[PDB]
Amino acid sequence: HHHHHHSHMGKQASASYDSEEEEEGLPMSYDEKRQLSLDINRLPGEKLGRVVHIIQSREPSLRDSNPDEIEIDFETLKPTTLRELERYVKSCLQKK
């Protein structure tokens, strides 16, 4: 015989589109490319593991041509994949 109460009440989700986004998704500034750039490469093979995971999962490269090296060209990378990989690493760290 031991009695202790929990407590969880209320739940609501409210969200829609960010913008119209009639295109694929290119509302990214150069600053956005710069932000995901340093944030990825400063962090070890864990986040470098996540960046190479996503780019090679959509478009493979290294496995065909020199698997010991990969270059992630953010400035000429698709802004869809950039903004996707950006929000992914941001929610992967949850740090401010």
Binding site: S37, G45, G49, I70, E71
Partner: protein, 89 residues
């Protein structure tokens, strides 16, 4: 200057190579706990005989399981691009 001495620790498990003609097929067995220690020989458990320390080898603890293929950032001809190189385990 080489003193005819092998430091074998008493209490250590050591592989005792079968004393006879120099063939790779007579190998060591055990490993046996060192009971007695002299400058040039040692007596161990299991074999119940004195062995010359040149014909003996100290056993390994185990090792260190440490592996991970990882990416390393080099400075390239870049605005904000990076070059990730897969390093050894």
């Amino acid at each position: 200057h080489h003193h005819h001495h092998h430091s074998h620790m008493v209490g250590d498990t050591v592989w005792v190579r079968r004393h006879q003609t120099k063939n790779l097929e007579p190998r060591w067995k055990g490993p046996y706990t060192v009971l007695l220690t002299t400058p040039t020989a040692l007596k161990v458990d299991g074999i119940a005989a004195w062995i010359h320390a040149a014909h003996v080898k100290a056993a390994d603890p185990g090792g260190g399981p440490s592996s991970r293929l990882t990416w390393r950032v080099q400075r390239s001809q870049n605005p904000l691009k990076i070059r990730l190189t897969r390093e050894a385990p």
